[PDB]
Each structure stands twice: as C-alpha cells, then as structure tokens.
Amino acid sequence: SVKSEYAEAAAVGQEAVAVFNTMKAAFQNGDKEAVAQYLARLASLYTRHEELLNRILEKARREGNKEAVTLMNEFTATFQTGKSIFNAMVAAFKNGDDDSFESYLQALEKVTAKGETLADQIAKAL
Ligand SMILES: Nc1nc2ccc(F)cc2s1
C-alpha cells in the first residue's frame, strides 16, 4: 500500500539521519576521507528518498487523498530546502571551507528537525 511505501521511505530517511550523524562526528574529528565517503553515501540516499516521496505524492494524487497531497506538497517543498542546503555543504567540503560546512550542517539539522511533525502527520493521513 501507499502506507507501507511511506514506511519504506521513512526508513531510508532514518538511514540518512544515521549516516549524517556519523559524518558530523568524522567532520569534527578531521577525518576528511571518511567525510567524503559519507557524503557520497548521503547523496545516493537522498536521491532515493526524494524519488520514493515523489511516487507517494503522485499516488496520493491519483487516489484523490486531498489531505495527504497537501501535507506531502508541503513536505516535499521542505525536503528541497534540505537538499539545497546539503548540496551547499558538499560544495563547501570540496572548497575546503569548514566555516561554511559547519553552518550548512547546523541549518540542515534544523530544517530536518522542523519537518518531523509533518513527517508523522503524513503517516497518519495516507
Ligand atoms: N531534512 C533533510 N535533509 C536533506 C538533505 C538532502 C536532501 F536532498 C533532502 C533533505 S531533507
């Protein structure tokens, strides 16, 4: 069902949270080789999550589930805020700008924490 598809999407999201926290530790410790690998792993994970979310939103639209579509439209918009901040983090890493990397990382954390009550509301609406 769309609901089990959202549970699968949510797990992929939690995998990115786990890898992100590991990456943040590696950044603080200065292990740039690890950070590079974790950033590649996060890119693939966000690419997967985004696509799953899109399929869920498209299915909610085909089902006529207006509330779930509203919530998912908002949530995907927020996801793209996170995506832009993540990409800016990756560029800061490439450029060696640790000040910007720290900034973007904290902003990604706050964007993620904010969009959590919505994430739960979607599970209930689908
Ligand atoms: N809370 C979030 N972080 C990211 C990071 C990258 C991305 F593409 C989407 C999101 S949503």
Polymer length in residues for the chain:
126
Q: Which residues surround ligand 1 with Cβ inside 6 Å?
A: 46, 50, 79, 82-83, 86, 108, 111-112, 115
Say how many Å lie between the CA of residue 114 and the centre of ligand 1. 12
The long-range contacts involving 60-67, CB below 8 angstroms and separated by at least 24 positions, are 60/2, 60/126, 63/2, 65/125, 65/126, 67/125
Give the Cα separation of 7 and 63 in Å (integer). Answer: 18
The coordinates were experimentally obtained by: X-ray
- Using CB atoms within 10 Å of the CB of residue 72, give its burial: 0 to 12 exposed, 13 to 18 middle, 19+ buried: buried
Nearest CA to ligand 1 atom 6: 83
DSSP letter at 115 equals T
Nearest CA to ligand 1 atom 2: 82
Nearest CA to ligand 1 atom 3: 82
H-helix or E-strand containing 80? helix 66-95
Say how many Å lie between the CA of residue 37 and the centre of ligand 1. 17
Nearest CA to ligand 1 atom 8: 83
Joined tokens for residue 65? 């589930």
- Using CB atoms within 10 Å of the CB of residue 1, give its burial: 0 to 12 exposed, 13 to 18 middle, 19+ buried: exposed
Asked whether the beta carbons of 56 and 72 are under 8 A apart, the reply is yes
Give the Cα separation of 22 and 88 in Å (integer). Answer: 19
What are the domain boundaries of the chain? Answer: 1-126
Report resolution in angstroms.
1.6
Asked whether the beta carbons of 68 and 125 are under 8 A apart, the reply is yes
The long-range contacts involving 65-70, CB below 8 angstroms and separated by at least 24 positions, are 65/125, 65/126, 67/125, 68/2, 68/122, 68/125, 68/126
Give the Cα separation of 124 and 67 in Å (integer). Answer: 10
